[PDB]
Amino acid sequence: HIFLEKHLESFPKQGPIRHFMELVTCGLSKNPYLSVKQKVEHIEWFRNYFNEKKDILKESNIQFN
Amino acid sequence: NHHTYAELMQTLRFLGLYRDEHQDFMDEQKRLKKLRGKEKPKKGEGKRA
Amino acid sequence: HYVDWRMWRDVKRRKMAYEYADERLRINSLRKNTILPKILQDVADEEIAALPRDSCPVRIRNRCVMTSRPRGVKRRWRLSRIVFRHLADHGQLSGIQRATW
Amino acid sequence: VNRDTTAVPYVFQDDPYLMPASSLESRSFLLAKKSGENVAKFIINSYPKYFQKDIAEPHIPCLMPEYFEPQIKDISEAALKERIELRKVKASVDMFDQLLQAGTTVSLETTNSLLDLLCYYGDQEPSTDYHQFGVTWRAKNNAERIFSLMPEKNEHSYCTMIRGMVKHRAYEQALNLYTELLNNRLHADVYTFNALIEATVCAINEKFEEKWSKILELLRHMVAQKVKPNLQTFNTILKCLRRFHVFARSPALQVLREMKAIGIEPSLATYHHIIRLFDQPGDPLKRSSFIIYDIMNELMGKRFSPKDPDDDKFFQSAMSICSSLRDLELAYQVHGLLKTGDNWKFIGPDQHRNFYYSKFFDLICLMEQIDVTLKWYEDLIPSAYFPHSQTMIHLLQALDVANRLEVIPKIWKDSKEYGHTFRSDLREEILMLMARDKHPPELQVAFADCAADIKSAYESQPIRQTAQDWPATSLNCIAILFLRAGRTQEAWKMLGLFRKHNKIPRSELLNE
Amino acid sequence: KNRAARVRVSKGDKPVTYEEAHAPHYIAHRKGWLSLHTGNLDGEDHAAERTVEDVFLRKFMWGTFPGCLADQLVLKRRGNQLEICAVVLRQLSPHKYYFLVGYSETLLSYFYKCPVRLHLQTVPSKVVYKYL
Amino acid sequence: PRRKALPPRTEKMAVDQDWPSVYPVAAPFKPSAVPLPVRMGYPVKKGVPMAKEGNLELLKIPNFLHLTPVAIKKHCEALKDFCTEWPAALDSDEKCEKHFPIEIDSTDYVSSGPSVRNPRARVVVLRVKLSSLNLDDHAKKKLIKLVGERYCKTTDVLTIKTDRCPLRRQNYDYAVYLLTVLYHESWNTEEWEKSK
Amino acid sequence: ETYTEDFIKKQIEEFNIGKRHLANMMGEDPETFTQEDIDRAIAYLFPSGLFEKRARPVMKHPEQIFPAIQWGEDGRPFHYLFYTGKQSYYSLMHDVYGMLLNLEKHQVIGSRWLIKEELEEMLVEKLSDLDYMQFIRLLEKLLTSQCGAAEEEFVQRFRRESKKQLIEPVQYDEQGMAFSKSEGKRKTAKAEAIVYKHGSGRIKVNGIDYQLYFPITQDREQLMFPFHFVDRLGKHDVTCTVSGGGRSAQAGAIRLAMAKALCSFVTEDEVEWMRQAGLLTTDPRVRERKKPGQEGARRKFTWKKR
Amino acid sequence: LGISIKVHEPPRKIERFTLLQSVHIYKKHRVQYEMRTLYRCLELEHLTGSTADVYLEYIQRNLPEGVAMEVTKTQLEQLPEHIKEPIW
Amino acid sequence: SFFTKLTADELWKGALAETGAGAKKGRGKRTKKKKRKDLNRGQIIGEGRYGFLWPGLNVPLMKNGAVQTIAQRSKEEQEKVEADMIQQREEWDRKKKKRERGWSGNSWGGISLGPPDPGPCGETY
RNA sequence: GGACCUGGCGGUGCUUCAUAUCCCUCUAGAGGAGCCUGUUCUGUAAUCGAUAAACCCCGAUCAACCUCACCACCUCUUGCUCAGCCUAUAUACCGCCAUCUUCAGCAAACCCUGAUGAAGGCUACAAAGUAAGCGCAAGUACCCACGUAAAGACGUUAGGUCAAGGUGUAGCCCAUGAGGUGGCAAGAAAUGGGCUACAUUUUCUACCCCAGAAAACUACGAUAGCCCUUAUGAAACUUAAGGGUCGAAGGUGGAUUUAGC
Ligand SMILES: [K+]
Ligand SMILES: [K+]
Ligand SMILES: [K+]
Ligand SMILES: [K+]
Ligand SMILES: [K+]
Ligand SMILES: [K+]
Ligand SMILES: [K+]
Ligand SMILES: [K+]
Ligand SMILES: [Mg+2]
Ligand SMILES: [Mg+2]
Ligand SMILES: [Mg+2]
Ligand SMILES: [Mg+2]
Ligand SMILES: [Mg+2]
Ligand SMILES: [Mg+2]
Ligand SMILES: [Mg+2]
Ligand SMILES: [Mg+2]
Ligand SMILES: [Mg+2]
Ligand SMILES: [Mg+2]
Ligand SMILES: [Mg+2]
Ligand SMILES: [Mg+2]
Ligand SMILES: [Mg+2]
Ligand SMILES: [Mg+2]
Ligand SMILES: [Mg+2]
Ligand SMILES: [Mg+2]
Secondary structure, three states: OOOOOOOOOOOOOOOOOHHHHHHHHHHHHHOOOOOOOHHHHHHHHHHHHHHHOOHHHOOOOOOOO | OOOHHHHHHHHHHHHHOOOHHHHHHHHHHHHHHOOOOOOOOOOOOOOOO | OOOOOOHHHHHHHHHHHHOOOOHHHHHHHHHHOOOOHHHHHHHHHHHHOOOOHHHHHOOOOOOOOOOOOOOEEEEEOOOOHHHHHHHHHOOOOOOOOEEOO | OOOOOOOOOOOOOOOOOOOOHHHHHHHHHHHHHHHHHHHHHHHHHHHHHOOOOOOEOOOOHHHOOOOOOOOOOOOOHHHHHHHHOOHHHHHHHHHHHHHHHHHHOOOOOHHHHHHHHHHHHHHOOOOOOOHHHHHHHOOOOOHHHHHHHOOOOHHHHHHHHHHHHHHHOHHHHHHHHHHHHOOOOOOHHHHHHHHHHHHHHHHHOOOOOHHHHHHHHHHHHHOOOOOOOHHHHHHHHHHHHHOOHHHHHHHHHHHHHHHHHOOEEEEEEEHHHHHHOOOOOOOHHHHHHHHHHHHHHHHOOOOOOOOOHHHHHHHHHHHHHHHHHOOOOHHHHHHHHOOOOOHHHHOOHHHHHHHHHHHHHHHHHHHOOOHHHHHHHHOOOOOOOOOOOEEEEHHHHHHHOOOOOHHHHHHHHHHHHHOOOOOHHHHHHHHHHOOOOOOOHHHHHHHHHHHHHHHHHHHHOOOOOOOOOOHHHHHHHHHHOOOOOHHHHHHHHHHHHHHHHHOOHHHOOOOO | OOOOOOOOOOOOOOEEEOOOOHHHHHHHOOOOOEEEEOOEEEOOHHHHHHHHHHHHHHHHHHHOOOOOEEOEEEEEEEEEEEEEEEEEOOOOOOOOOOHHHHHHHHHHHOOOOOOOOEHHHHHOOOOOEEEE | OOOOOOOOOOOOOOOOOOOHHOOOHHHHHHHHOOOOOEEEEOOOOOOOEEOOOOOOOOHHHHOOOOOHHHHHHHHHHHHOOOOOOOOOOOOOOOOOEEEEEOEEOOOOOHHHHHOOOOHHHHOOOEEEEOOOOOOOOHHHHHHHHHHHHHHHEEEEEEEEEEEOOOOHHHHHHHHHHHHHHHHHHOOOOOOOHOOO | OOOOOHHHHHHHHHHHHHHHHHHHHOOOOOOOOOOHHHHHHHHHOOOOOOOOOOOOOEOHHHHHHHHOOOOOOOOOOOOHHHOOOOHHHHHHHHHHHHHHHHHHHHHOOOOOEOHOOOOHHOOOOOOOOOHHHHHHHHHHHHOOOOOOOHHHHHHHHOEEEOOOOOOOEEOOEEEEEEEEEEEEEEEEEEEEEEEEEOOOOOEEEEOOHHHHHOOOOOHHHHHHHHHOOOOOOOOOOOEEEEEEOOHHHHHHHHHHHHHHHHOOOOOOHHHHHHHOOOOOOOOOOOOOOOOOOOOOOOOOOOOOOO | OEEEEEEOOOEEEEEEEEEOOOOOOOOOOOOEEEEEOOEEEEEEOOOHHHHHHHHHHHHHHOOOOOOEEEEEEEEEOOOOHHHOOOOO | OOOOOHHHHHHHHHHHOOOOHHHOOOOOOOOOOOOOOOOOOOOOOOOOOOOOOOEOOOOEEEEEOOOOOOEEHHHHHHHHHHHHHHHHHHHHHHHHOOOOOOOOOOOOOOOOOOOOOOEOOOOOO
16 A cells, blocks of 8 residues: 555656656555555556657657656 | 435335325325316326417 | 435436546646646646536535535535424434523 | 243233233234234345445345346356256256257256256245145156256266155155166265165055064165265154054164264254154053153253254153153253253244143142242243143142142232133133132132132123123132122122023022 | 424313423423434534434334324434334234334344344323323 | 233332343333333423333433343353453553553544444554664664654654554554664664764 | 322332332342432433433432322311311411410511422412411511510421631641642633742742733732732742633632632631632633624624614 | 553533524524533553453443443554664 | 425324414405315225235234235235225215204204203202 | 494603613714625616515525526426426415514413493402413523523514425416526615724834834825736636735714614
């Protein structure tokens, strides 16, 4: 529940996305109302979401996978 | 869930195990209006056309 | 078998707000920051506004559960002042008594 | 905490109006409460959607609607196993042909699970909430049809067929089916051998000597197939031998002497079938007396666990044998063995329980001092059982013998609270006893207060089909109890009823 | 003038009960409460769900025991258990009472997922406190 | 004809009986079981309190007829086989903090209803003095700077409160994990600690 | 509801039997089971929190719970004044008027006249206000006359806390100094004051010199008042600790505490002067609550006469 | 059972709230209701797990209707092995 | 809904309008007074439209010495019970729905009031 | 038409009076200014209800959408519901209240008077009234005995509310029902209540009561306007907060009037 940065290995190591996904995992680590299965869902949703905005993320110089 | 409460006690009244005094009241008032002529019309075949 | 249509609309509203709760949360998170580019935040502003209006939680109204009264409702019992007093005046609400001091 | 001697069984409502008075109400008040739980489950399984909502934490699986209707509506091998766990005999047998007709391979473990459901119920549907004599093993039954179709048959196949025939009184055919099992170089199990001993004797009503030789052959085959007997195997032999009351006496003991050697602790049932066999309607009962004494010492100071269904019957049997022997020292051991641990649950159903206490309280009154007999009457009744007329009359013959005729105005108040208010035989033995002899004023005025309550009962009666009838003796006694007491005024108003109903008055009433 | 839970004065032929003879300002001075749970205590929750159960239970018993209820129900909760205590008339036969006890106990136990027990106290006639 | 109610069993009751057997467990007031002429209610002008028969005021009361002194003493005599003896060595509280310097807090809530859940049961508080830990000058100074307001200088007690995880066994393991990283991080001297 | 003697006689037997049952429940001895234990056992077995004590379960003797025919079978009333309607009241006026005639022939604090409501219990007769006054006028007339010994007993039947401060026990500290401790209350302020027998007039409030703690002179004047009145300023050392309230509520609470603790080091006569000066009384004036329909405690919202 | 126990009574809490008296208009006329919560703290000391288990079950089961409970348990633990000495 | 349902006493009290401003000062005609009817008079516990026979409540618990099981009336048999119930209702109503006039038809004068009420002390007229 | 009864009224008499009250008398206010808010007029395609005392920050312990009932356009038809209706009637009602009540009277059942008329019914050194029940009172709550709450009848005003909900009667049923999208709820004017002020007993700062500055066209004084940002939210010139700019009227208020021991 508290160490959720094992799941960010398919994300950029440095950048805005990492800084954004280090806030999602800090808030999800402070959440006693979700299970671990539900917390990964959130993380997997952004991964699928940033894979579909690759063209928009190239304009802003972000190399997501 | 008003459905569950309203459907359970409707079934229990038809099975005879719950006596609703409110429906009886309005079952008798609707029975006394058929004798007085004030019966609900058939849909489509209304007073207007 | 709800009190009225006004109550029935809220029931649907509350059901549609529970289905899109997570989707709306994930999309707002992008908007509620100064980290991501405006280009991406502008695309999320169009995605959360295209969802059904009834998924928005600001349309949910806390009505009474017996008489569907929109105002004069007590949140702890989800009852209107009129229905609360009726049960309280008959000694049916544990602990509730009239105050004198 | 112990039992409340002043209250009825907890299951009943603690309220004078809802308290069961008689023994008929006791059984009829629990059947109407069980009818409300069946009428509620009916409604809980017919309309589950109302009760599907679950607000309990932790989840209560026993407060959720059951779902009997099958779900898999296709035709596969896994859709049949779902209709066999729901005991859908008709659907499974009709859905098996379609599956078999298609030609899909059917495992041997799935066709043996269908025979079990057909061989057990005998191709008949189980009882449902809503939609003895003779043989229930029809010749045109699915159990035999599906048996032939099967291309391969293992041990379990026959084993579950022989047991299905004996259960539905098809004894004769099971023995014919057991010869085939021997022809296929197979080996039966213990359960299959258990039913073969029941069928053997039951099949033909031959003399015991021939039957004994026959039974020994199965047991010798049981030891030739590396089969180990269990408790039920011996229990059937004793149950089967019941018919040959006398002759079986000594042989039955042999069965009990082989259960110890091979380490098989006899249960309550094993002893229940011996005493019934030995027990016979004979005046001497010399043999029966010794048997029960030895059995009780062995059982003495033991705690029991359920093993065979017949275990419950033992307690009723022992008390009956004790009342026939008129021995109270042996009834205190049987009732003392019912109190240890939790053996009090083997007493039996309501019918068995009342019979046990009746025979028990009837041997206490007759045999022991009248001071303790009134302590057993306050404990058992009504908390344990409601009495039958013969028990109140048995108690009245003890007070008479114990010159304690001052409790009769208390025995009549209780009778009215136990449903014997209008029992002719009860009122005909209470009045005569009170009026038999003259008693001091203080005691003579109390009997008159019971005759004024017993007289009201005759005036008002529940059954109005026939005209009110007053027994000759009652009227003869109610009037003489008024005179002696001092109620002369009322003694002269009863004179008209003597000739009105043509009831002959005794000389002792006129002389006085 | 105030009207709530007050029985107006009459010639004297109207019989009222103790609970029916006292107004709301006596609910904690001369009367108790007909339902007793912890929902309304400081720091307790689920006060709105225990309330809906009470409103329905009082109606379920009023329509399931028609003409048999002398006085209002006294609902008691101890943990999972729910205890319904009632005063009933003796007009109805006992056979029918036992049926209604097993039907209501069982039905309400599967509906509110909790052990429900009902304790009847029959009375000959409606206890009368005074005649207003 | 019309059924007639039986007389109450109170009359049968003896003065020298066993009351616990009548009221073994909690039950509502049964006037036919309680052999007491107890009345309740506010009397009318020139009147007396209402009798127990049909009294709805005596049914509202949560009685303690099942918890009479004779019973409690009888109940607890049978419950002495479940209890364990407290180590005699631990006389006072100063001696308990020498062998057991860590105190764990955990709360259980009992409320009426069908659900027993409560989110307040997950909170775990861990208290431990810094004098019972093998700390030096540097470690103790650094450990007080990481915990912030969790350490009270007046009592020299570090309080760790964990409510992050749903279960109380996870928050207890997390509080013991925080104490270890803070202890092993207080002894580790970095290269940026020279600019103090 | 009329209760005869036979009904009350059956209630006497049920209480005695119920009194032996309640002693078996609690495990006491039936013989020495008083009525105070019954009140204690019924409050444990039947716990009621009703504010009215007359609405709670009670198991008393039938002579204290329940509150007769005035003619025989023939129908003649026993008393000769039956037809008056108030035979008990008029028999008393006839007796009192008969004792006032004999006197002619041969010739206080702590007590109050029986109230009207208490006089209807001795006679079991409803009485008007005016009739009660008439009876009192005859009794007073009886007292003025030279009544005999017997008459005094008759009048006594109809007839039914020193205002001194409670001195605190002087204690002694480790060093041996004598002092007295007391407590005060003013509005929401509570104060504890320790007054040493011998001192140099030093006061410390919460560990701070009083002039520093109380800048406003008025507050200091309140502190002086007790000592100035007993003309002993600069003779005791005070150490007080006040908590709650505000500036002026704390002084008043200390004044009262010092004054109460200074009564142990003064004579009885001086303590009565302090009482008559209002230094030992607790001011009961506290803030009044606001009402739902008004702007304030007593202020009302503007009346729209317009 | 041989347990040390101390009893005190924490100050009560009274929650009040006001409501309109009439169904319609008449704002100046309202009704006030309150809920009174009374406390009672039983502080036992020097128990064991087994002793607390049976005692709590016994009193918890007999807890009367309308009465909640909050059991706060202070457990004694020992320093973990890792905390005994630093990992040089 | 099911929570917006009152009791019979509350429904008739509002329908009859017996206590109101109109009654107080001759403001209401008596030409067509509304009349209270008991809708529970001829109702048996356990009888419903589906025609289910509940052992121990609707019908005898035991038949021929054996306990009955849950059964449901057939359409033909349940249709005869509803129609026979109506007949009892009409008969009861019909009976509820002759006088000797005095000097005039609507005149009170000349009408008999019977004998005076008996006195308490054994007096009769 | 004559003579009585009751009740109401009287620019009817007399007497005792109101104890925060009728008037004078004490204190702070209102009415004058600006703002906030409600109402009425007007306006708009665009709700309803309350509306002398007893309406007017009243239902609402609350309207950006929702709430919503309104308007315009489009759509559906056994329709979430063994339908539905915020359709009319509060002058059919229950229910919950207001008011006189900062009262004590209300009243069954009897009795008597008046020739057995409607009607009426007391005198304490007593002359026809007795009275359950109701209310008052007493008890209770809060910090007591005080005080404040609460309680406060029977009636009155066909008082208020069918739009809390329910409901009798009459009415609609391809529409007087149901759903969707967008939208209005403004201000020439008048008025009620409130907030802030007109300052020096004040303004600002420090402190929380021993201080230093300010002080009339850069003073006192807007919670208004304008601009920006932020918060909530899907959505804000729009709601709220804050900052910046701005620096108005106003200079202590006529007749009249409110509250408070
Ligand atoms: K006049
Ligand atoms: K103005
Ligand atoms: K009205
Ligand atoms: K309405
Ligand atoms: K209507
Ligand atoms: K203004
Ligand atoms: K300012
Ligand atoms: K002004
Ligand atoms: Mg934004
Ligand atoms: Mg909203
Ligand atoms: Mg003010
Ligand atoms: Mg009011
Ligand atoms: Mg005519
Ligand atoms: Mg308007
Ligand atoms: Mg709008
Ligand atoms: Mg009106
Ligand atoms: Mg009107
Ligand atoms: Mg008072
Ligand atoms: Mg008030
Ligand atoms: Mg009062
Ligand atoms: Mg419309
Ligand atoms: Mg719209
Ligand atoms: Mg500005
Ligand atoms: Mg300025």
